[PDB]
Design an enzyme around this catalytic site. Structure first.
Site, PDB file in Angstrom:
ATOM      1  N   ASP A  25      40.530 -61.874  16.609  1.00  0.00           N
ATOM      2  CA  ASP A  25      42.030 -61.202  15.766  1.00  0.00           C
ATOM      3  C   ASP A  25      41.590 -59.834  15.269  1.00  0.00           C
ATOM      4  OD1 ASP A  25      43.169 -60.552  13.984  1.00  0.00           O
ATOM      5  OD2 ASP A  25      42.818 -62.314  12.072  1.00  0.00           O
ATOM      6  N   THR A  26      42.037 -59.483  16.238  1.00  0.00           N
ATOM      7  CA  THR A  26      42.269 -57.891  16.078  1.00  0.00           C
ATOM      8  C   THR A  26      42.525 -56.721  15.059  1.00  0.00           C
ATOM      9  OG1 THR A  26      44.393 -57.291  17.494  1.00  0.00           O
ATOM     10  CG2 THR A  26      42.298 -57.481  18.156  1.00  0.00           C
ATOM     11  N   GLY A  27      42.488 -58.276  14.037  1.00  0.00           N
ATOM     12  CA  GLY A  27      43.415 -57.335  13.032  1.00  0.00           C
ATOM     13  C   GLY A  27      42.543 -57.741  11.531  1.00  0.00           C
TER      14      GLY A  27
END
Ligand code: DRS
Ligand code: DRS
Lengths: 99, 99
Positions: A25-27
């Site tokens: 998850d880059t968020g």
């Protein structure tokens, strides 16, 4: 590996000696794992997401093997819908976004 | 381009005639944009994540340019703290995770 995004980027990780499925998850600033027992002392912390804030247990310097790549860092344990590998560990395994 | 994860992967997007900063989020199934008076019909929707759920307005076939790459699809509008570009649009611009 190169992972496309037609499906959720779920991968197997090993943490505390146990295998689990987690989302790359880059968020996420942080890594959040579902309630589980982890060795060592933890500190009470709170983190926010899309729907509000939750209380988590902060464990520091925890080894986590992600799809065969090694990372050792902060892992937050608490009520999360799905296990999340956040940027703190994604940077350790050399993960980048490309388009 | 290639975007590292040392910092939040924020990029400029164009939607509804406005330029905004948004987070390239592999952990998001959908695209959620901060409250904006977007014209068009919409459908009620609830999306969840850490902290719980929030109510959003679902708009379909909305053009969204992401760092110069054109896309078009579903955009959810609501009280999100950060603009989020989810997988529905990341796939459209050929974005992958690599390590
Ligand atoms: C998993 C949390 C530790 C992360 N939350 C964070 O990275 C801390 C900031 C939360 C408030 O701002 C947000 C920033 C990003 C998001 C949502 C909200 C996207 C969302 C995601 O994973 O898709 N990230 C989060 O909820
Ligand atoms: C950024 C949000 C839209 C959210 N995505 C997030 O909140 C980032 C990951 C939080 C923990 O993992 C998830 C939690 C919930 C979901 C998917 C993943 C369900 C899904 C939905 O309601 O449609 N929510 C998301 O993809």
């Amino acid at each position: 590996p190169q992972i496309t995004l037609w499906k959720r980027p779920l991968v197997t990780i090993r943490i505390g000696g146990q295998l689990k499925e987690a989302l790359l998850d880059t968020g996420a600033d942080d890594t959040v794992i579902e309630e589980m027992n982890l060795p060592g002392k933890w500190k009470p912390k709170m983190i926010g997401g899309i729907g509000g804030f939750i209380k988590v247990r902060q464990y520091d310097q925890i080894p986590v093997e992600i799809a065969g790549h090694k990372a050792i860092g902060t892992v937050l344990v608490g009520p999360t819908p799905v296990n999340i590998i956040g940027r703190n560990l994604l940077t350790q395994i050399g993960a980048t976004l490309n388009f």
